[PDB]
Amino acid sequence: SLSESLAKYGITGATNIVHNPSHEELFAAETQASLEGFEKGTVTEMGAVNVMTGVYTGRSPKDKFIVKNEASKEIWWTSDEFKNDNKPVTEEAWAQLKALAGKELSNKPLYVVDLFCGANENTRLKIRFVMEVAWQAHFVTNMFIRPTEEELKGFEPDFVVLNASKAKVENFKELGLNSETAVVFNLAEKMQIILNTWYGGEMKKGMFSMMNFYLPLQGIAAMHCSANTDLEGKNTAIFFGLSGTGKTTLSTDPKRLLIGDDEHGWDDDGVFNFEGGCYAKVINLSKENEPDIWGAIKRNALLENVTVDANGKVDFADKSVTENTRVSYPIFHIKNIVKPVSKAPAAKRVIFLSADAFGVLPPVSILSKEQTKYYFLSGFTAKLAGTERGITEPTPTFSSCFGAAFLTLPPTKYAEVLVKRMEASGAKAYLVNTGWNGTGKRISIKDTRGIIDAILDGSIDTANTATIPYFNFTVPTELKGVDTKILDPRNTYADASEWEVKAKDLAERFQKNFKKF
Numbered sequence: 001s002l003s004e005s006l007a008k009y010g011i012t013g014a015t016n017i018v019h020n021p022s023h024e025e026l027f028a029a030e031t032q033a034s035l036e037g038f039e040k041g042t043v044t045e046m047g048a049v050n051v052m053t054g055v056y057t058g059r060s061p062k063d064k065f066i067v068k069n070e071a072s073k074e075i076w077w078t079s080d081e082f083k084n085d086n087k088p089v090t091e092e093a094w095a096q097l098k099a100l101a102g103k104e105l106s107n108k109p110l111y112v113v114d115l116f117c118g119a120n121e122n123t124r125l126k127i128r129f130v131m132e133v134a135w136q137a138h139f140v141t142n143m144f145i146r147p148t149e150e151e152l153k154g155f156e157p158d159f160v161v162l163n164a165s166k167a168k169v170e171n172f173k174e175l176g177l178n179s180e181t182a183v184v185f186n187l188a189e190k191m192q193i194i195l196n197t198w199y200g201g202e203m204k205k206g207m208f209s210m211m212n213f214y215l216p217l218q219g220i221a222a223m224h225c226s227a228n229t230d231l232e233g234k235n236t237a238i239f240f241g242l243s244g245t246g247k248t249t250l251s252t253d254p255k256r257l258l259i260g261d262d263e264h265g266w267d268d269d270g271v272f273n274f275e276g277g278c279y280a281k282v283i284n285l286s287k288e289n290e291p292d293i294w295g296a297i298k299r300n301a302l303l304e305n306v307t308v309d310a311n312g313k314v315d316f317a318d319k320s321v322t323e324n325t326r327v328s329y330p331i332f333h334i335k336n337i338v339k340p341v342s343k344a345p346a347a348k349r350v351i352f353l354s355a356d357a358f359g360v361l362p363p364v365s366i367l368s369k370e371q372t373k374y375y376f377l378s379g380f381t382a383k384l385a386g387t388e389r390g391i392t393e394p395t396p397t398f399s400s401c402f403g404a405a406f407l408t409l410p411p412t413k414y415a416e417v418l419v420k421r422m423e424a425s426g427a428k429a430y431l432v433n434t435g436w437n438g439t440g441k442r443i444s445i446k447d448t449r450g451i452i453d454a455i456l457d458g459s460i461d462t463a464n465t466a467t468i469p470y471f472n473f474t475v476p477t478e479l480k481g482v483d484t485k486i487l488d489p490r491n492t493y494a495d496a497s498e499w500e501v502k503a504k505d506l507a508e509r510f511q512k513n514f515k516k517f
């Protein structure tokens with residue numbers, strides 16, 4: 001049965017098959033002393049197992065490709081006019097890549113995990129993961145929605161994901177690839193192959209990209225955002241933001257119930273999470289500053305690339321190798337969460353998080369209808385903390401919809417459905433700088449949380465306002481529980497002219513960039 005299914009994926013001769021392993025079975029497997037290299041798992045003092053993934057400490061967008069065929073006719077392909085990560089490959093290259101992954105996973109012990117991507121049955125995807133490494137199976141078990149034993153019976157996948165990280169593409173040049181690493185998608189065969197990259201995120205972001213294709217085509221918005229509700233479970237709020245800009249951090253609120261922190265859909269019913277866990281950043285983590293994440297880090301959680309010594313002591317501050325240290329864990333490792341299903345009513349507040357490394361954007365701007373669409377499409381922010389391989393220092397960028405690297409349809413399609421939903425729920429939008437200002441340092445988290453509070457409780461709705469030049473941003477002149485001085489981007493500069501010259505330049509950059517739409 002299962003072996004016959006694997007055969008169709010090109011995998012044969014399996015010596016043992018573990019189907020949806022439990023957490024305890026995963027722990028024992030991960031802690032076996034004979035595990036070599038990137039497969040080795042170390043038990044930390046936190047009680048959770050930690051693994052290292054070498055140089056693959058972030059996504060590999062340059063190695064992401066989509067097979068060009070009838071099934072991917074609607075893919076938002078890359079072009080000189082509008083460059084993106086959707087690079088095309090041929091069926092001929094695919095057969096060879098697939099065969100490569102198949103051979104790698106053949107004749108050996110394998111893990112097969114059947115999961116759900118999407119909290120709603122009417123739009124979810126059934127994913128079957130196949131891998132030879134125990135912690136990899138643990139990673140998907142934490143990040144995806146876990147089906148009951150009944151639902152596993154007769155489980156028929158909609159998408160197959162073959163993780164063949166141990167294999168590499170040496171002849172990538174002749175196959176039209178970019179390097180020995182490869183993350184390819186075939187919508188005809190509905191399969192994802194992972195070759196030569198051990199980064200955990202490749203296992204969740206691939207299907208996220210697929211959900212970003214099917215959902216919008218059904219009028220359902222697919223969003224790179226975190227989302228929570230009040231303690232009553234109403235007044236849903238969503239936080240859009242590029243990798244490492246604040247979604248997880250700011251959605252973490254004691255006065256809120258967490259829906260999800262990274263991937264969400266917005267249908268007729270409301271906002272729902274695609275995942276069953278959180279893949280949080282842990283750099284500089286401390287029990288005092290991040291109680292929840294810290295408490296979530298225990299057995300069954302999986303630390304990734306954190307510094308651990310002999311005694312199993314962890315140094316969450318070491319970023320020498322990477323500042324994109326992570327940890328995945330079932331969402332139920334967090335106390336304040338929406339249940340029994342990660343879904344809630346339509347959002348009332350939509351927040352666009354932007355890490356402006358230019359120090360031009362004010363801490364918070366109250367956006368108009370036109371501005372809401374405009375800044376959502378522009379997605380101005382910055383690639384940071386090694387979320388993508390190669391990016392070390394803050395790099396200004398225009399990532400459409402604050403998640404361009406995961407967009408499989410034109411950004412306008414995402415904006416279209418988002419506005420549609422916002423209009424129906426009467427949601428208001430805001431642009432929040434989680435980046436830098438005149439001080440050359442990032443805006444204080446204390447003030448940012450204070451701004452988030454004013455947005456969620458309506459305080460900002462009646463706050464005194466002023467207009468910021470060039471962008472014509474409407475900003476509050478003051479807010480309770482917020483440092484007044486920072487509200488105006490100009491106040492942290494010795495000479496206002498410094499900000500002006502930068503604001504003027506940034507403004508036209510927007511103008512030129514928006515032309516590609």
Ligand SMILES: Nc1ncnc2c1ncn2[C@@H]1O[C@H](COP(=O)(O)OP(=O)(O)OP(=O)(O)O)[C@@H](O)[C@H]1O
Nearest residue numbers: 243244245246247248249281434442443444445448
């Ligand atoms: N004002 C601020 N607001 C939010 N985060 C801030 C701020 N200043 C600094 N930070 C830091 O920026 C980082 C944001 O990380 P977070 O995990 O929230 O990113 P994310 O949007 O969830 O990324 P991903 O989608 O990659 O998971 C944290 O390390 C946080 O401490």
Ligand SMILES: [Mg+2]
Nearest residue numbers: 248261262280
């Ligand atoms: Mg996050």
Ligand SMILES: [Mn+2]
Nearest residue numbers: 224242243262
């Ligand atoms: Mn993300």
